[PDB]
Design an enzyme around this catalytic site. Structure first.
Site, PDB file in Angstrom:
ATOM      1  CD  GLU A 190       2.870   2.448   1.831  1.00 27.93           C
ATOM      2  OE1 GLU A 190       2.243   3.491   2.118  1.00 27.93           O
ATOM      3  OE2 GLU A 190       2.796   1.404   2.511  1.00 27.93           O
ATOM      4  CG  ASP A 198      -5.336   0.160  12.210  1.00 26.26           C
ATOM      5  OD1 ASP A 198      -4.309   0.760  11.831  1.00 26.26           O
ATOM      6  OD2 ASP A 198      -6.081  -0.474  11.432  1.00 26.26           O
ATOM      7  CG  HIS A 218      -3.788  -0.605   8.301  1.00 27.65           C
ATOM      8  ND1 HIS A 218      -3.435   0.402   9.173  1.00 27.65           N
ATOM      9  CD2 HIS A 218      -3.092  -0.378   7.162  1.00 27.65           C
ATOM     10  CE1 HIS A 218      -2.566   1.206   8.585  1.00 27.65           C
ATOM     11  NE2 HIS A 218      -2.341   0.754   7.364  1.00 27.65           N
TER      12      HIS A 218
END
Ligand SMILES: [Ca+2]
Ligand SMILES: [Ca+2]
Ligand SMILES: [Ca+2]
Ligand SMILES: [Ca+2]
Ligand SMILES: [Zn+2]
Length: 316
Positions: A143, A226, A231
């Site tokens: 992240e 997505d 991803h």
């Protein structure tokens, strides 16, 4: 936030004991004044309103289960800061030592974590699919790397740019995991994923297809889910990255591994000096080759390995 710098002790999501940097005025707050403009960890109190309250503790000891995710978010944000500073000579995410903020206990049974454009956000998981996601180091670094990317290359989150974005995040997440030397591997999210099922993970860089992601460009996801498979198709770049570092033979193409450090330097250089927001896989190849050329010279083994690696995954 104005107070005396000190050190507290606590227990993380996996039950490991940890010292953490805290600040004292009338309460011990999780604020780390030793890194840049500071690392601040907040309590979202199971709601969705952000950031929430700056974490406050009476005795500077966090052993409560409720404490566990805050401990790890605070700590691992520190390790990640340390990584970029010591290895890559970068000061926080923006290079200017911007403050790093994390909120834990986000919503209820929330199985994800994310960078919202400002701060990092961590769910507690439902206790089945996930446990609190700040528990993984590669998650935190993953992240946090999104911010780095956002402030440098600015890869749009969609299609191939997005896939690259995600790949970068996984790569450097893994590198941070290796850096901290905490049960390192080429898997993503293995620590916080599916308690009760040993040996699995969310994604695999060594063998993406294990979890159903493409290891080859001809296998790429072309649909609209997505954000165009950011991803999913990341698996293709992830495999290439794995091969650069560790070497191997993939679809009959052999790659000599140059190691983790050089992988890191190459990709950081590509990220900061070359990639643009709309960059695609091919352009990434070009960027990485140019970077490796910059660092190690055009006739070097490194360039050769980058080339081999991207040839292996069918990115020309
Ligand atoms: Ca306490
Ligand atoms: Ca691990
Ligand atoms: Ca991992
Ligand atoms: Ca598991
Ligand atoms: Zn991501």
């Amino acid at each position: 936030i104005t107070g005396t710098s000190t050190v507290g002790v606590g227990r993380g999501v996996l039950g490991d004991q940890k010292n953490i940097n805290t600040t004292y005025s009338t309460y011990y707050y999780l604020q780390d004044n030793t890194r840049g403009n500071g690392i601040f960890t907040y309590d979202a109190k199971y709601r969705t309103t952000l950031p929430g309250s700056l974490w406050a503790d009476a005795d500077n000891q966090f052993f409560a289960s409720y404490d566990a995710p805050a401990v790890d978010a605070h700590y691992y944000a520190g390790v990640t800061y340390d990584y970029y500073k010591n290895v890559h000579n970068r000061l926080s995410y923006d290079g200017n030592n911007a403050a790093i903020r994390s909120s834990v206990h986000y919503s209820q049974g929330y199985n994800n974590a994310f960078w919202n454009g400002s701060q990092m956000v961590y769910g507690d998981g439902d206790g089945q699919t996930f446990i609190p996601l700040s528990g993984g180091i590669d998650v935190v670094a993953h992240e946090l790397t999104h911010a780095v990317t956002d402030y440098t290359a600015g890869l749009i989150y969609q299609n191939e740019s997005g896939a690259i974005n995600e790949a970068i995040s996984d790569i450097f997440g893994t590198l941070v995991e290796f850096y901290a030397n905490k049960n390192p591997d080429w898997e993503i999210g293995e620590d916080v994923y599916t308690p009760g099922i040993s040996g699995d993970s969310l994604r695999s860089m060594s063998d993406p297809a294990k979890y159903g992601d493409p290891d080859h460009y001809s296998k790429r996801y072309t649909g609209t889910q997505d954000n165009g498979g950011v991803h999913i198709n990341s698996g293709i770049i992830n495999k290439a990255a794995y091969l650069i570092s560790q070497g191997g033979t993939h679809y009959g193409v052999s790659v000599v591994g140059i190691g983790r450090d050089k992988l890191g330097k190459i990709f950081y250089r590509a990220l900061t000096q070359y990639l643009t927001p709309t960059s695609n896989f091919s352009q990434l190849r070009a960027a990485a080759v140019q970077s490796a050329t910059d660092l190690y010279g055009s006739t070097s083994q490194e360039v050769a390995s980058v080339k081999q690696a991207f040839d292996a995954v069918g990115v020309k």
